[PDB]
Amino acid sequence: RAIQGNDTREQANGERWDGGSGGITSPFKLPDESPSWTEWRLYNDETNDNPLGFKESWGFGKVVFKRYLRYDRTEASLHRVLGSWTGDSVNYAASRFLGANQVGCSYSIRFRGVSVTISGGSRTLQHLCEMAIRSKQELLQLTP
Amino acid sequence: RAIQGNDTREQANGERWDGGSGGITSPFKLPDESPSWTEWRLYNDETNQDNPLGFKESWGFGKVVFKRYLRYDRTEASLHRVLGSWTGDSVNYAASRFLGANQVGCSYSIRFRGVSVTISGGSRTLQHLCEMAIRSKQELLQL
RNA sequence: UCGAAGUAUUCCGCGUACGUU
RNA sequence: CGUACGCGGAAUACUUCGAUU
């Protein structure tokens, strides 16, 4: 399109708050689970090992998709949140925002105050996923 | 008056080339192996499917950043030589030389085959950044 | 947790300039 | 690859404010 970046970036932002059945083609499979200001507050009577969950995001150039998924330190909750994005969902989702000119891609995830970013060129997105599902894996299993 | 580093950042910068000096405590345990501009087009005849000279990694403790480029030819004897570039105690020993009455944001980065892996986080979790950085380094260098 | 601002950094993508030519 | 900046991003650390009452 003409501008081609400003409007698509706003829809990617809004995609987070439009549940799993609203917005544009998203790289994530599961909907957002951000905690309200009140359920994140009363949860911090402990307080801020051992959060409600983690915050992850997928960025294809200027088109960034963000998520928050409540992740308890359990085997089942790990298999659940790991199904929030796969290689296919990213590739298919990136296909609608990449072109001939290589843009920057980045997957970032924060948990326990530790952030991991897997960034690279559009032509390296294939490795960014393998490295992101491997990095995401350990960060969530990072033995205290 | 809480300004400790005017300027230690540039000292950690030059530590890569002519150093470590004078006295800067570096996190890395190996000298820098950055190739020349020519050698950057000699080994690299023209990148064929890729195989680089090695990788570039950096260590940051606030605004004090250290950087190292190393050779890595995909051999196990080379993986082991580059994992000794920095360890847990080394960087921890290096981070304790740059702190303050405040939480500072540390950062490890490594680039290999057009893929970068940064592990950022407050100095309160540096112990985690290392444990996570050694796995990321090993994993990235094993694709 | 959401949104915004400043400060101090890092990293990616792209591009300019230079580098015993 | 080295240096320096330019654009657009993402991430971090400190700080400030707003978030049906």
Q: State whether B114 and A131 contact (CB < 8 Å).
A: no
Q: State whether B113 and A134 contact (CB < 8 Å).
A: no
For chain B, the domain total comes to 1
CATH at B54: 3.30.390.180
The spacing between the Cα labelled CA in A70 and the C1' in D20, in angstroms, equals 25
Instruction: Indicate if CB(B62) is under 7 A from strand C.
Output: yes
User: Radius of gyration of chain A from Cα atoms?
Assistant: 16
* Residue of A117, A7, A1, A138 whose CA lies nearest to A59: A117
Amino acid at B136: S
Strand A63-70 and strand B64-71: the pairing is unpaired
Distance CA A69, CA B76 (A): 38
* Residue of A57, A122, A46, A118 whose CA lies nearest to A91: A122
**DSSP string covering B4-51, please?**
--SSSHHHHHHTTTS-S-SS---S-SS---PPPTTGGGTT-SS-----
- The CA distance from B21 to the nearest CA of chain A, in Å, is 31
> What is the H or E stretch that residue B88 is in?
helix B88-95
DSSP structure class, residue A97 = T
Positive or negative torsion for Cα B3, B9, B12, B17: negative
Footprint of strand D on the protein (CB under 7 A): A 5, 37, 55, 57, 59, 61-62, 64, 66, 104, 106, 108, 110, 113, 115, 117, 119; B 13, 16, 34-37, 40, 52, 56, 67, 69, 102-107, 118, 120-122
Distance CA A129, CA A136 (A): 10
What is the residue range of B110's domain?
A: 1-143
Which residue in B50, B56, B116 has the most chain A C-beta atoms within 10 A of its own C-beta, making it the best mutation to test that interface?
Answer: B116
- Structure-block tokens of residue A31: 């909907």
B122 touches chain A (CB under 8 A): yes
DSSP structure class, residue B76 = H
A130 touches chain B (CB under 8 A): yes
Resolution in angstroms, to 1 decimal, for this deposition? 2.6
**Would you say A26 and A15 are in contact if contact means Cβ atoms under 8 Å apart?**
yes
Distance CA B129, CA A36 (A): 29
**Would you say B133 and A138 are in contact if contact means Cβ atoms under 8 Å apart?**
no
Q: State whether A114 and B117 contact (CB < 8 Å).
A: no
Distance CA B57, CA B28 (A): 10
- Structure-block tokens of residue A114: 């530790």
- Find chain A residues with C-beta within 8 A of B116's C-beta: 117-120
- Measuring CA to CA, how many Å separate A43 from each of A33, A35, A40, B50, B97? 15, 10, 5, 48, 36
Please, which residues have CB within 8 angstroms of residue B136's CB and are 6 or more apart in sequence? A116, A135, B108, B110, B117, B119
Distance CA A109, CA A84 (A): 12
**Would you say A72 and A24 are in contact if contact means Cβ atoms under 8 Å apart?**
no
Task: Please identify which residue in the block is written with the tokens 């969530």.
Answer: A140
**For helices A87-94 and A125-141, angle between their N-to-C axes, nearest 10 degrees:** 140
Q: Is B98 helix (H, G, I), strand (E, B) or coil?
A: coil
The spacing between the Cα labelled CA in A81 and the C1' in D4, in angstroms, equals 44
- The CA distance from A139 to the nearest CA of chain B, in Å, is 7
Task: Please identify which residue in the block is written with the tokens 């680039």.
Answer: B111
**Which experimental technique did the depositors report for determining this structure?**
X-ray
Q: State whether B118 and A113 contact (CB < 8 Å).
A: no
DSSP3 helix / strand / coil % (chain A, rounded to 5)? 40, 20, 35
